[PDB]
Amino acid sequence: SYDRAITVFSPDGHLFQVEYAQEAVKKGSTAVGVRGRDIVVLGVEKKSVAKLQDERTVRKICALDDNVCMAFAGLTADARIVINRARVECQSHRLTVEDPVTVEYITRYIASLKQRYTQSNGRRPFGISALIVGFDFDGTPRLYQTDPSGTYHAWKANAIGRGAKSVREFLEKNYTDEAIETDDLTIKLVIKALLEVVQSGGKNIELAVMRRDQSLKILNPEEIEKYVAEIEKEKEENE
Amino acid sequence: FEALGIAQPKGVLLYGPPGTGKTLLARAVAHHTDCTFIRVSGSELVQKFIGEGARMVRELFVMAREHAPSIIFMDEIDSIGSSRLEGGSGGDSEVQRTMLELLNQLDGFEATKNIKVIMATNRIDILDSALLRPGRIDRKIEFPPPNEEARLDILKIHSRKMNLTRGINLRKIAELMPGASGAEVKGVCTEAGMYALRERRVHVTQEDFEMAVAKVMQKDSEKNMSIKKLWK
Amino acid sequence: CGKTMLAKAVAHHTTAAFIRVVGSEFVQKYLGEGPRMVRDVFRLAKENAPAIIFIDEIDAIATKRFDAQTGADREVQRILLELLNQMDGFDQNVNVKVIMATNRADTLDPALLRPGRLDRKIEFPLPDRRQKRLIFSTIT
Amino acid sequence: KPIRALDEGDIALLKTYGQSTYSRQIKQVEDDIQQLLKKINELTGIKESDTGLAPPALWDLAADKQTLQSEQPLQVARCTKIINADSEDPKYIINVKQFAKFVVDLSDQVAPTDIEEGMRVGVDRNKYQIHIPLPPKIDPTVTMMQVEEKPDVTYSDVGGCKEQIEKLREVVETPLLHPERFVNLGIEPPKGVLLFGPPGTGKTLCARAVANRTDACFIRVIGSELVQKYVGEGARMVRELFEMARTKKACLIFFDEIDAIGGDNEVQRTMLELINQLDGFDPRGNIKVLMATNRPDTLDPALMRPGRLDRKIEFSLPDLEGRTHIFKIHARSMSVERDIRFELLARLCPNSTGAEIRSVCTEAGMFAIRARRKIATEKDFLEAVNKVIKSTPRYMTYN
Amino acid sequence: TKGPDAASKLPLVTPHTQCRLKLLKLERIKDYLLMEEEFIRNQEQMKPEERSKVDDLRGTPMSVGTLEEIIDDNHAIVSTSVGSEHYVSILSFVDKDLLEPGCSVLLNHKVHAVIGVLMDDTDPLVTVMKVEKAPQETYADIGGLDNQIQEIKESVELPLTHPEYYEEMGIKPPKGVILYGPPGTGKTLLAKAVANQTSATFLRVVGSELIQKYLGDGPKLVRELFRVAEEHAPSIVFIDEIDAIGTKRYDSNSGGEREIQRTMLELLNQLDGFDSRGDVKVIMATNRIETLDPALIRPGRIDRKIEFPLPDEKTKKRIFQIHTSRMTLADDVTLDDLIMAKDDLSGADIKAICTEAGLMALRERRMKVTNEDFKKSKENVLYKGTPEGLYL
Amino acid sequence: RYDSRTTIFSPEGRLYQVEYAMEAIGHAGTCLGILANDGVLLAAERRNIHKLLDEVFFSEKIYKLNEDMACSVAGITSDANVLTNELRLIAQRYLLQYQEPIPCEQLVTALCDIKQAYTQFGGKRPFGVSLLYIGWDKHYGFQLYQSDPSGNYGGWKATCIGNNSAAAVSMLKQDYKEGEMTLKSALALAIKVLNKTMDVSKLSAEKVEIATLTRENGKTVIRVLKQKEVEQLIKKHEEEEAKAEREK
Amino acid sequence: TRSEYDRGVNTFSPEGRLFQVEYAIEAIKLGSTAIGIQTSEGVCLAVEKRITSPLMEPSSIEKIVEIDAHIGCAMSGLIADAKTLIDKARVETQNHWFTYNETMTVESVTQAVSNLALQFGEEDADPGAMSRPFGVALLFGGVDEKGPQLFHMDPSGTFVQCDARAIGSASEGAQSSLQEVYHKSMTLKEAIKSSLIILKQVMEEKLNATNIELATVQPGQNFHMFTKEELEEVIKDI
Ligand SMILES: Nc1ncnc2c1ncn2[C@@H]1O[C@H](COP(=O)(O)OP(=O)(O)OP(=O)(O)O)[C@@H](O)[C@H]1O
Ligand SMILES: Nc1ncnc2c1ncn2[C@@H]1O[C@H](COP(=O)(O)OP(=O)(O)OP(=O)(O)O)[C@@H](O)[C@H]1O
Ligand SMILES: Nc1ncnc2c1ncn2[C@@H]1O[C@H](COP(=O)(O)OP(=O)(O)O)[C@@H](O)[C@H]1O
Ligand SMILES: Nc1ncnc2c1ncn2[C@@H]1O[C@H](COP(=O)(O)OP(=O)(O)O)[C@@H](O)[C@H]1O
Ligand SMILES: [Mg+2]
Ligand SMILES: [Mg+2]
Ligand SMILES: [Mg+2]
């Protein structure tokens, strides 16, 4: 029919292969990114390793450059490929223009790459969705979401993967101007958004934070328990 | 069950590879129960006359209810209840009607009481989801091929009536049957007995069991080595 | 290679009640009549003296079970399942030996090819050397 | 860890141990409740049926005894081939329902003239001779044959099928209203049209609208009726309805769901009888037939042959203007605001049939009821069209 | 017509916690039952020509037939149950105004003249198809499905109760409603809840029950069922497993398939027969909605289509609260790890999980279900996707 | 249906050709590797030794890639050879470019990128081969990685792929004491796993293929267990099992 | 049986219709309404945002983009396909400014953009290009030597001079309204009022600041996209 062909329009004008690739992201794992006044955070749901998998190489949050980071959801191999291409392009852009790559440019490159991978037969679309975060060299908080279709959008705080709709509604009901006044408030917001779907807390949660140009350090497993303890303390404080 | 606050489980499915003990377990539970056991082994509810299968299901359940707490054994349930096929034309529809009547009897508007039911099949994966659904079938029991200890137990059960010779090591025979169903173990016992019979003796030796294992478990392998070496 | 002839010879040299059926005969036009015929033939063998059931061309109905997607395939698999449950089902049979001959054993359902249903799968290979001499002598 | 079967001691302890002191009393009382309810249902019973005995003012008991003794009971049968009676072979094949078929003579009461093939013959029980023909006397106010004289729907009510309504206007009005024009153009008036289109398009409604405009009575016949129990004498059904239409003034015959009839022994009798009532009946009559089904091909090939049903009107799913007109028509009968953007709703439901539109309006009414509001709002219509129609993908890649 | 003969509906005892108040309420109900039985028995004890001659005229036995036509006031066309039909007379004492095509006339054994009419004929099948004891399940026993319950109450309850809104808005009441979804979602439970709370006659039907062996028995059974529903108005007809007969219409070759198609065309015709303003509604449930005929679900026949999705997280926890509301759980049981696990748990699956956890507790000689018991139970009852590693 | 060329997406989002490449590994010979405190090993099953195989070979399942690299193969033989040749090529290319032995992560990612490219585009069947890379580096000492036909990979300390791999890995995780296994304990565990996962009451040394990587005195040595060595190991295990059963 | 001619763009129907191109045409009806009007004082472009979530940053949704200071654009269709079309339009405008050192007319802009389009059925796609028709409709407006000029581009590559054209999910209704509400000497202010009136009449949601992006081009000023305050001023009158 009209489904098994990437470059064939359906009678109702749908490229159903592109939509199927988009839906393949929903089978991934939840990843929410929030941008604040001075911080941008990347909260993802970490799959619990059974007994032997090395968490060091199950990387879900990866840094394209010193000024940009991103979290994906939907296909690990396609994600790895697009990550390598994104860092190669970041280095090439810094070679061509000598200034660090803005979040908009790298997001546009990723979107264009995925698009050019979904415009011809014999090229399966990249079945991942990316949440580009980082600061431009002028110091502005920008967050971007790239779709498997090859399009990108600017979000203040978006979620991808499975259960992304629920986290989206949570952020709609809880994203306020004062909620990003301090870094700890943004951390509380993103942790609450994650616990909306991954209710166990503690483990199964990975956070990466970006202040103004510090070469982000992913929150190591020594204060994530501390941060969730503060979250629980506040949770019993208001109730 | 009442004080626990739970609802009584109703049906169990006995699935597994053929010759593992499903029908044997049903026979045993029929032997050792005070309930009025019922054998409604599959394809007996498939009648030529239209709508007779559903009527037979209704009469079967009304009779099971009329008697004491009863047990219904649907052997080879794969036959009538497999999967509802889309549309008609060449698709089966009357057997689907009988199956749907059985489903509604099992867990429908009426909520039958004390009508515990047992079903068996070799292909659970092809059974319909509306039949495998819990509340209609709880505790889907799997009958895996016996391990070495269980194979030894089956050998000792089926060799109880034989005249074994002093020095028989049934443990070695059990170790000689990797991944062998219980039916194949019984067949091994029978073939060892026949090897004894052919020489017009009454006792059975270890060599007899060894050749019986070789004969019963004999199977066709991949003769072409080239095909077999496709995979590393 | 002598299968049906051996069945004929068995029927000759038997004191049993011999019931001869062919596999395709079981498959009926009306729904549920094939399994009914299987039930009746096995019940006739049971209620009679020690009896023998010979089902020539068993693989006409006893092919390996698969995910049947139409009514006819479902009915044929129902016939096979009724055969299985009649041979080694809940109510065991006494003094009812069943002989079935086929050309393609490998296509038979594994549930049919297990001890307790088919205790012996006897191969009838093409005659070799001595067997060819014996056949030539007994035919000439 | 092997499971251990619950020992009798464990069974005894688990039963009592932690339990309500009242639990025994509760269980006993509940069981007694069930037993008492069963006892009440046992001791009420025997509700008197009181069969249909009229008051004794109407019982002429002697007369009923005499009619029991005298009046013979006649089984009802369906007649068949006349076997060339012509006073030399006064015999007919009659099929006595499920009992059997027979070949029987007449009765002194009946005459050959009123007995032919196909009507209900009352045969006796000894010799099975036909003793009284029983015409079905159908005239069915208990079922279909709408027989509506002037349908309430009008020319304004039908919306969107402007091309369709114009083609219908031509065929069933220009001969009907201006016969002289067809006469002086040297052409037989259009014998009929087959109104084919997807179901729910409204072809029936458009036909009833022109019927109301023609002031000619609208007759709607279903097919499933004479597929189901009222089969057989359907030939006499159409015979009597065509006859009363001849007695009636200018008419408009309309067959909907006729696909069931067209798609066959008694059914074949029905269409050869309508062949006799269309070809045999002069094509100049004012009983114009309006054929209508979704299937354009399932109709029997001998039906649309020239000298019979002559054209075909192809109804199609309403367009944007059609959809908004249907929306306004259906919302007129509803308590809604005066600023509902019906063009918006028509846009939001592309490729939507008229039945889908009426269902959308009904769902909007239900949504308004849900919030306990006497007036339906535009948001209710939006939610209704979101529910009925469509039974992120279109918002994130398209824009 | 006689009004709705609803179910028995014994009053519900609210505590259910095995306390004194439960004892008080149950003893009160028992007291009222005892004073009812006393009255019925004592009034049975206390206090004790033309009819006999008309019985003589009727004779013995008297056959039962269905009236189909009435030629004159003294002749009609009755049909015996066998299928044969006769031109018979009507005797004077038969009350004429009750004669209506489709009734149950009483026929003399010899010369089958109409000697009476039977107001209640309902055959054993349609009689058992009528609910007498309301199911104990209630809307309180349904977790989640707030939208589904709301829609069903708008469909089969709001017209039954104060309906002035429906004609105030000018829209018709929804004639018939169909429930669909994956097996075990609550389709039958939601019908039990409706029957428990209804005030109208509830007619449970298996769908496959309507099909009958003898020719013409299927459509006759459907016709009798809906005739009872109308005559029992207001009434609700719950045809569970409609896909038993609701499959795609296809050209029939065998006689049995022709009879099946005849039965469904009769059901569709009689669904069309009554007006939506009538107080008889139909409720149908199925798992294979896609395999239904796209004419039974026409907007002019069954407008509503209530979807039953697999319960979400909050609905899952509501169902768990409902089914563990009678357990003696410990303080350690979180019940949140189970509803966490992204699975396809349904209401039936949750109930089975609770039952299996109880059985694990029994297996440990304890009556207080713990978190470990629930943990093992969830794995035990869940049977049988994407390879692990592809989708992160 | 959506079971055409690999560059297709099921409506639910599944890559069915990739899924079939996944499930195809269950037909391959069973191979496993375990990470010990001071060594790593690869244990593989010789599924096809009928009577007359020359055994002119160093290892069929285990393939050495670099002076610090070794891996075991499980899949189609042709794709196996192609992937091993590409592994050697990329390892030596990294050595030439950087004058340093290639890290395990980098080489595994290179091969997995190649494999993904074979399922990302081109209308080419994905490599139906799953790998178990063994190696050492200064970055993370001893590492074990399990590849995947889909182009994924993972760092493991104990992993079995092939037939009966699910049961083998389940019991292995049930019987793995992380951080406290030497080479001898790892070898005994591997022998026990191969015993429980293969269809033989007493597995022979011929059906078993074991290679051990150990870093000692500045250099990493990759050696396959000689026939005498593997026979001694299996006999030590069978007497240990005899002691266990007589004690029970 | 239209299905055999459905698959692929290089297949002719028995009626000679390019069915895949027709489907690309209909794929415009899935884009938000865009309205452009031609006036003597300039051209105005109004669009519908269709904001999915209040959290979304409005500036990311680019219904109206700048090809050059003298020309404006409005879009309806796939975001990706448009993005490529817009990049090609800007690149060709800069190519003209490089080679001829002049401001290229909007007619030539739409000519070049259509040249990039209608290339799906061509063999020059070997290095890499679109094998399917572009599924985005383009609304080009600006001022050139012929005064202000508005052009609408068809996914098949057809362009036409339109005094007032509406594209998107509601092309039919908005076009029908513009048919009777358009007048030749209509001033720019009353043109913008008319455009906002049509958008309000045709929008699914109510009219506010975040539901519409407004652009205008007049001979004096360059391309101007209406800022927030200008949007409030122009929306308080309506
Ligand atoms: N665990 C066991 N112990 C003893 N005997 C066994 C065991 N399992 C199977 N058998 C024997 O194997 C034979 C096969 O019959 P059984 O009822 O066990 O088959 P089944 O598992 O129901 O197979 P099928 O699916 O073909 O019905 C019987 O004679 C039974 O006694
Ligand atoms: N929302 C719910 N809340 C509580 N219990 C529920 C819910 N849904 C289902 N259940 C439980 O599931 C059991 C079976 O559900 P039910 O009989 O309604 O299924 P169904 O959807 O009609 O299934 P089928 O169509 O497969 O026959 C009920 O007895 C009830 O205990
Ligand atoms: N062992 C044998 N001795 C003599 N004749 C044989 C022998 N085997 C086969 N034949 C000849 O071949 C025929 C056997 O055919 P049959 O056994 O029916 O084949 P199938 O194996 O298909 O049943 C007999 O008619 C006989 O003449
Ligand atoms: N053009 C139309 N104008 C108004 N109502 C319509 C139109 N088309 C269909 N309907 C609605 O459809 C319903 C009945 O459709 P119907 O005429 O039975 O469909 P069919 O075309 O199958 O005969 C009526 O309620 C009617 O209001
Ligand atoms: Mg069995
Ligand atoms: Mg033969
Ligand atoms: Mg149900």
mmCIF file with all atom_site columns, N, CA and C in Angstrom, chain E residues 248-266:
data_model
loop_
_atom_site.group_PDB
_atom_site.id
_atom_site.type_symbol
_atom_site.label_atom_id
_atom_site.label_alt_id
_atom_site.label_comp_id
_atom_site.label_asym_id
_atom_site.label_entity_id
_atom_site.label_seq_id
_atom_site.pdbx_PDB_ins_code
_atom_site.Cartn_x
_atom_site.Cartn_y
_atom_site.Cartn_z
_atom_site.occupancy
_atom_site.B_iso_or_equiv
_atom_site.pdbx_formal_charge
_atom_site.auth_seq_id
_atom_site.auth_comp_id
_atom_site.auth_asym_id
_atom_site.auth_atom_id
_atom_site.pdbx_PDB_model_num
ATOM 1  N N  . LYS E 1 248 ? -18.097 -9.886  9.321  1.00 0.00 ? 248 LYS E N  1
ATOM 2  C CA . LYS E 1 248 ? -18.319 -9.282  8.014  1.00 0.00 ? 248 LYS E CA 1
ATOM 3  C C  . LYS E 1 248 ? -19.353 -10.069 7.222  1.00 0.00 ? 248 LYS E C  1
ATOM 4  N N  . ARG E 1 249 ? -20.271 -9.351  6.581  1.00 0.00 ? 249 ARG E N  1
ATOM 5  C CA . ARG E 1 249 ? -21.249 -9.984  5.709  1.00 0.00 ? 249 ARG E CA 1
ATOM 6  C C  . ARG E 1 249 ? -20.556 -10.446 4.436  1.00 0.00 ? 249 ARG E C  1
ATOM 7  N N  . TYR E 1 250 ? -20.770 -11.707 4.077  1.00 0.00 ? 250 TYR E N  1
ATOM 8  C CA . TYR E 1 250 ? -20.259 -12.251 2.832  1.00 0.00 ? 250 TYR E CA 1
ATOM 9  C C  . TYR E 1 250 ? -21.327 -13.141 2.218  1.00 0.00 ? 250 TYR E C  1
ATOM 10 N N  . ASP E 1 251 ? -21.230 -13.329 0.903  1.00 0.00 ? 251 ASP E N  1
ATOM 11 C CA . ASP E 1 251 ? -22.181 -14.173 0.192  1.00 0.00 ? 251 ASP E CA 1
ATOM 12 C C  . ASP E 1 251 ? -22.173 -15.589 0.753  1.00 0.00 ? 251 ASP E C  1
ATOM 13 N N  . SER E 1 252 ? -23.356 -16.132 1.010  1.00 0.00 ? 252 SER E N  1
ATOM 14 C CA . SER E 1 252 ? -23.463 -17.426 1.664  1.00 0.00 ? 252 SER E CA 1
ATOM 15 C C  . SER E 1 252 ? -23.710 -18.526 0.643  1.00 0.00 ? 252 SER E C  1
ATOM 16 N N  . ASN E 1 253 ? -23.139 -19.698 0.907  1.00 0.00 ? 253 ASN E N  1
ATOM 17 C CA . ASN E 1 253 ? -23.326 -20.870 0.064  1.00 0.00 ? 253 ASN E CA 1
ATOM 18 C C  . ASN E 1 253 ? -24.023 -21.999 0.812  1.00 0.00 ? 253 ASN E C  1
ATOM 19 N N  . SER E 1 254 ? -23.532 -22.359 1.993  1.00 0.00 ? 254 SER E N  1
ATOM 20 C CA . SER E 1 254 ? -24.152 -23.419 2.772  1.00 0.00 ? 254 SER E CA 1
ATOM 21 C C  . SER E 1 254 ? -25.435 -22.926 3.433  1.00 0.00 ? 254 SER E C  1
ATOM 22 N N  . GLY E 1 255 ? -26.298 -23.878 3.793  1.00 0.00 ? 255 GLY E N  1
ATOM 23 C CA . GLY E 1 255 ? -27.550 -23.521 4.442  1.00 0.00 ? 255 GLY E CA 1
ATOM 24 C C  . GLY E 1 255 ? -27.348 -22.916 5.818  1.00 0.00 ? 255 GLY E C  1
ATOM 25 N N  . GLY E 1 256 ? -26.370 -23.426 6.567  1.00 0.00 ? 256 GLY E N  1
ATOM 26 C CA . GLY E 1 256 ? -26.112 -22.887 7.892  1.00 0.00 ? 256 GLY E CA 1
ATOM 27 C C  . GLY E 1 256 ? -25.649 -21.443 7.856  1.00 0.00 ? 256 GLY E C  1
ATOM 28 N N  . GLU E 1 257 ? -24.777 -21.107 6.906  1.00 0.00 ? 257 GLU E N  1
ATOM 29 C CA . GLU E 1 257 ? -24.349 -19.720 6.772  1.00 0.00 ? 257 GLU E CA 1
ATOM 30 C C  . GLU E 1 257 ? -25.509 -18.830 6.349  1.00 0.00 ? 257 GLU E C  1
ATOM 31 N N  . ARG E 1 258 ? -26.398 -19.347 5.498  1.00 0.00 ? 258 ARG E N  1
ATOM 32 C CA . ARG E 1 258 ? -27.599 -18.594 5.151  1.00 0.00 ? 258 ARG E CA 1
ATOM 33 C C  . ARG E 1 258 ? -28.455 -18.336 6.381  1.00 0.00 ? 258 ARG E C  1
ATOM 34 N N  . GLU E 1 259 ? -28.594 -19.333 7.255  1.00 0.00 ? 259 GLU E N  1
ATOM 35 C CA . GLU E 1 259 ? -29.374 -19.133 8.472  1.00 0.00 ? 259 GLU E CA 1
ATOM 36 C C  . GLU E 1 259 ? -28.704 -18.130 9.406  1.00 0.00 ? 259 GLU E C  1
ATOM 37 N N  . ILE E 1 260 ? -27.375 -18.156 9.487  1.00 0.00 ? 260 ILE E N  1
ATOM 38 C CA . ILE E 1 260 ? -26.661 -17.187 10.317 1.00 0.00 ? 260 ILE E CA 1
ATOM 39 C C  . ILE E 1 260 ? -26.885 -15.775 9.791  1.00 0.00 ? 260 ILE E C  1
ATOM 40 N N  . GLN E 1 261 ? -26.767 -15.601 8.473  1.00 0.00 ? 261 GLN E N  1
ATOM 41 C CA . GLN E 1 261 ? -27.017 -14.297 7.872  1.00 0.00 ? 261 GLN E CA 1
ATOM 42 C C  . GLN E 1 261 ? -28.461 -13.869 8.082  1.00 0.00 ? 261 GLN E C  1
ATOM 43 N N  . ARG E 1 262 ? -29.394 -14.819 8.023  1.00 0.00 ? 262 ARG E N  1
ATOM 44 C CA . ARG E 1 262 ? -30.795 -14.505 8.273  1.00 0.00 ? 262 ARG E CA 1
ATOM 45 C C  . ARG E 1 262 ? -31.002 -14.031 9.703  1.00 0.00 ? 262 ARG E C  1
ATOM 46 N N  . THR E 1 263 ? -30.363 -14.699 10.664 1.00 0.00 ? 263 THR E N  1
ATOM 47 C CA . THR E 1 263 ? -30.487 -14.294 12.058 1.00 0.00 ? 263 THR E CA 1
ATOM 48 C C  . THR E 1 263 ? -29.942 -12.888 12.269 1.00 0.00 ? 263 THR E C  1
ATOM 49 N N  . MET E 1 264 ? -28.773 -12.589 11.698 1.00 0.00 ? 264 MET E N  1
ATOM 50 C CA . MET E 1 264 ? -28.241 -11.239 11.870 1.00 0.00 ? 264 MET E CA 1
ATOM 51 C C  . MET E 1 264 ? -29.051 -10.191 11.118 1.00 0.00 ? 264 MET E C  1
ATOM 52 N N  . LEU E 1 265 ? -29.573 -10.513 9.936  1.00 0.00 ? 265 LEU E N  1
ATOM 53 C CA . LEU E 1 265 ? -30.394 -9.524  9.250  1.00 0.00 ? 265 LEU E CA 1
ATOM 54 C C  . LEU E 1 265 ? -31.679 -9.274  10.028 1.00 0.00 ? 265 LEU E C  1
ATOM 55 N N  . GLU E 1 266 ? -32.206 -10.306 10.691 1.00 0.00 ? 266 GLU E N  1
ATOM 56 C CA . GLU E 1 266 ? -33.349 -10.110 11.575 1.00 0.00 ? 266 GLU E CA 1
ATOM 57 C C  . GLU E 1 266 ? -32.989 -9.225  12.761 1.00 0.00 ? 266 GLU E C  1
#
